[PDB]
Structure formats: C-alpha cells, structure tokens
A and B are shown apart, each in its own frame.
Chain A
Amino acid sequence: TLDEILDETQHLDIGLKQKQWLMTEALVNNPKIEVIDGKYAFKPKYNVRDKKALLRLLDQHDQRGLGGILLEDIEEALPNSQKAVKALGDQILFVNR
C-alpha cells in the first residue's frame, strides 16, 4: 500500500495531504491500475515475469505468436539473452525489426 511504500522508503512524512492525494488520486489516474482491493499490483504484464515456459504462447497458433514484445524483458536477472540461449535451445525464436 502507499503507506507501506512510504514506511519502507522512510518517506512517511510526506504530509497527510500529499499522502492522501497520492493514495486517492495518483493511484487512480494510474492507467489500468490492477487493484483487487486493498493492495496495488502490476498492470502492464499479465503474465508473471518468471523468465520461462511460454509454451502456451508458442502453441497459441491463433495470432502468429501474439506479438512477443521485448519491452517487458531484459529487466530480469538474465538480460533476456540467458533465457534466450535456452530460448534459442528451445522452440523460442528471437528477432528484431
């Protein structure tokens, strides 16, 4: 929660007004904020960044691979490359435009 972030960042003294404005509005103007209830979550990537086993998307032969984008990649422990080599080893195919 915003209070938990404040807490962990030791920025809790942002002022209740700002704290409130951040909570009610900043995390509301948020594009498609995936928020089950109390706690905010990740919106862009539907799939958990688990660096492995996208055989579902490979066998999803209904959209020619579903526009596998790199924007949601290379930010993990292995810069896509480590996964790709195994990804190269496996069916996964990598290219760039």
Chain B
Amino acid sequence: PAALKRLAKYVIRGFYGIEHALALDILIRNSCVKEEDMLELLKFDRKQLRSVLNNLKGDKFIKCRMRYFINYRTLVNVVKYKLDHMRRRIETDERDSTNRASFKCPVCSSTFTDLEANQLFDPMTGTFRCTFCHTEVEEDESAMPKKDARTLLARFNEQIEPIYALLRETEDVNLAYEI
C-alpha cells in the first residue's frame, strides 16, 4: 500500500490545506500514532489538534484504536463519493435549457417566451411588441447565463483531471495491486 499512500500524497496536495496537510503527513506512517506524541511533535494547539482530529474523524480518515492511548488509520473510499455527487451537481448547472431566446422588453424588463411575443408579434412592423407597452422586445439578455456556465464548468471541472491524472491512475493501479 505504498502507492495507496501515493493517492494520499496527491489528495493532500489536491485538497486539504497546510494545517491539515502537516497532520496528514504524519498519518503517512500507519505503524503507531498516539495523541500525546502527535501533539508534542506537530507543535500544534491541543484544542485545535482535537479539532483537526475530529475533522479527520468526520472523514472516517482514521480508525481510532483505543488502548487511553490512541492509533489512527485510513478509511476514505469517498474519493468516489466526492466524485459521483460533485459530477451530478456540475452536470445540473451545466445542462442548460434551450436557446431559450424569449423576447424581453428593455423598457419594463419584462420577460417573454418566443411564444409570448409570438401572440404579440405585430404584423404591421414585422417584429415583436411587448404586452402593456408597445416598445420592441430584446434577447433574454443576462437572465441565466447557464450556457456560459456550462462551457466554463466543462473547461474548469474537466481541466483538473490532468493534474489529478497522476493519482486517478495510481489509485486505479494501486487498487488493482491490492486485489
């Protein structure tokens, strides 16, 4: 599991911050990890160390082995857990509606569908007139830039895979090594 500690080297790099990461570095050696030793070594605060440990406990990152004196060992199989749910939420914000180019009247900032201004469509002017005011309609304008968000997320969320490729690959090859 030396390359299992390598997926770990890449997640600490990829995610948790210096204060967390320094503690996580100690977690590297899964031989013996007491609370008094880790406190004295990290040169951290006891309340604060307890917060980080409690945070790591929340990850189920560690299996608190009681004597009382403690020991801590990896539990996260949630690398997929962050993945399946995050991909869902990003694909929700990505998947847009349609051209959804509803007429919108710039004077009253009222919103219409292509259907809304179609009933309004004024045959004497060959264009679309707003309802209560005859001022000509415009594009959905700003409204929801879900299409720009789709493009951005795609570049941004899938652009972090290459830098994660080292670990996405190590994990995959390490899991195969574990059998």
Binding site for B on A (CB under 8 A): 63-64, 67, 69, 93, 95, 97
Secondary structure type dominating chain B contacts: helix
Q: Does B22 contact A (CB under 8 A)?
A: yes
User: Is there an interface contact between B18 and A95, defined as CB atoms closer than 8 Å?
Assistant: yes
Measured between alpha carbons, how far is A93 from B19 in the docked complex, in Å? 12
Can you pick out 18 interface pairs between chain A and chain B where the beta carbons lie within 8 Å of each other? A63-B41, A64-B22, A64-B25, A64-B26, A64-B41, A67-B41, A67-B42, A67-B43, A69-B43, A93-B18, A95-B18, A95-B19, A95-B22, A97-B19, A97-B43, A97-B44, A97-B45, A97-B48
Count, A-B residue pairs, CB within 8 A: 18
Secondary structure type dominating chain A contacts: loop
- Over the window 22-36 of chain B, the binary record of Cβ atoms lying under 8 Å from chain A Cβ atoms (1 yes, 0 no) is 100110000000000
Chain A residues with Cβ under 8 A from B45's Cβ? 97
Chain A residues with Cβ under 8 A from B43's Cβ? 67, 69, 97
Chain A residues with Cβ under 8 A from B42's Cβ? 67
Measured between alpha carbons, how far is A79 from B19 in the docked complex, in Å? 23
Which 10 pairs from chain A and chain B are nearest by CB?
A67-B43, A97-B44, A64-B25, A95-B18, A97-B45, A64-B26, A97-B48, A67-B41, A69-B43, A64-B22
Instruction: Using CB atoms, name the residue of chain A closest to B41.
Output: A67
Q: Distance (Å) between the CB of B11 and the closest chain A CB?
A: 17
Measured between alpha carbons, how far is A84 from B25 in the docked complex, in Å? 23
Measured between alpha carbons, how far is A97 from B22 in the docked complex, in Å? 11
Chain B residues with Cβ under 8 A from A95's Cβ? 18-19, 22
Chain B residues with Cβ under 8 A from A67's Cβ? 41-43
Chain A residues with Cβ under 8 A from B44's Cβ? 97
Chain B residues with Cβ under 8 A from A97's Cβ? 19, 43-45, 48
